[PDB]
């Protein structure tokens, strides 16, 4: 029956709104000097004119990922490739062949737009793709 008395305060609700998360990934803020302290750089504008295009991830990172299977098969994967993937395969082969001293073994997945490379070249490929403007 008897219940504690209370007051309805709308003014303080603004603090509650601070606590609500966003579903949408925010767009990176504009910086005066690139790259940022963490090393991030936005994609070039306008897009580089090439036969292929490498889209950024939803987090605005370059989609180059290390992959391993069987505990020993180190591989590098380039995802979100659009356009002529075969043109990217030749460009990657010319770029990596000096470092290895041989033509790199690769697999082109035209359906998924994925280039798979044997060995770890994620760091080198990320910088290489950043220069192109992707």
Partner 1 sequence: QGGGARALDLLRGLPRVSLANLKPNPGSKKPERRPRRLGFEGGQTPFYIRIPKYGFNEGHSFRRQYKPLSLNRLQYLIDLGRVDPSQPIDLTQLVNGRGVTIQPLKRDYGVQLVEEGADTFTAKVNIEVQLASELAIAAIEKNGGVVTTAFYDPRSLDIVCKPVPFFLRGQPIPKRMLPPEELVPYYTDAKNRGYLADPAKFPEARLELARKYGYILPDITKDELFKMLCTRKDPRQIFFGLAPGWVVNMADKKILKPTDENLLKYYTS
Partner 2 sequence: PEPVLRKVELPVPTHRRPVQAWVESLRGFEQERVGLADLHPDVFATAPRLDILHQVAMWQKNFKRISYAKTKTRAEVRGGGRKPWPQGRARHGSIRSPLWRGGGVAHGPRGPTSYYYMLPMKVRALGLKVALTVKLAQDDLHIMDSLELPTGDPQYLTELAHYRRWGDSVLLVDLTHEEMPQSIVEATSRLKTFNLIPAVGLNVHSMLKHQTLVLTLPTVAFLEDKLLWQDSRYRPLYPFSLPYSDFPR
Partner 3 sequence: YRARPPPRRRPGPRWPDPEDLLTPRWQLGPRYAAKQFARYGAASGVVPGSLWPSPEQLRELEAEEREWYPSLATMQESLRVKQLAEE
Rank residues 36 and 57 by Cβ distance to partner 2 and give the closer one.
Answer: 57
Query: Do the beta carbons of residue 96 and residue 124 sit within 8 Å?
Result: yes
Given candidates 25, 39, 47, 67, which one binds Mg ion under the rule CB under 5 A? 67
What CA–CA distance (Å, rounded) separates 55 from 125? 14
Rank residues 3 and 13 by Cβ distance to partner 2 and give the closer one.
Answer: 13
Query: Do the beta carbons of residue 92 and residue 81 sit within 8 Å?
Result: no
What CA–CA distance (Å, rounded) separates 46 from 93? 26
Instruction: Kindly list the residues in this chain that would bind partner 1 in the complex (CB under 8 A).
Output: 4-10, 12-16, 18-22, 25-29, 31, 36-38, 40, 50-52, 59-60, 82-85, 87, 110-111, 113
Cβ 101 to partner 1, closest distance in Å?
30
Which of 26, 62, 23, 25 lies closest to 42, judged by CA? 62
Rank residues 4 and 46 by Cβ distance to partner 3 and give the closer one.
Answer: 4
């Amino acid at each position: 029956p008897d219940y504690p008395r209370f007051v309805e305060s709308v003014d303080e609700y603004q603090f509650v709104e601070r606590l609500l998360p966003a579903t949408r990934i925010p767009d990176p803020p504009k910086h005066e000097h690139y790259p940022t302290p963490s090393g991030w750089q936005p994609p070039r504008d306008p897009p580089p004119n090439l036969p292929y295009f490498v889209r950024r991830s939803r987090m605005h990172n370059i989609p180059v990922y290390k992959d391993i299977t069987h505990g020993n098969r180190q591989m590098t994967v380039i995802r979100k490739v659009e356009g002529d993937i075969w043109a990217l395969q030749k460009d990657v082969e010319d770029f990596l062949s000096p470092l290895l001293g041989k033509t790199p073994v690769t697999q082109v997945n035209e359906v998924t737009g994925t280039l798979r490379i044997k060995g770890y070249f994620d760091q080198e490929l990320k910088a290489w793709l950043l220069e192109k403007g992707f």
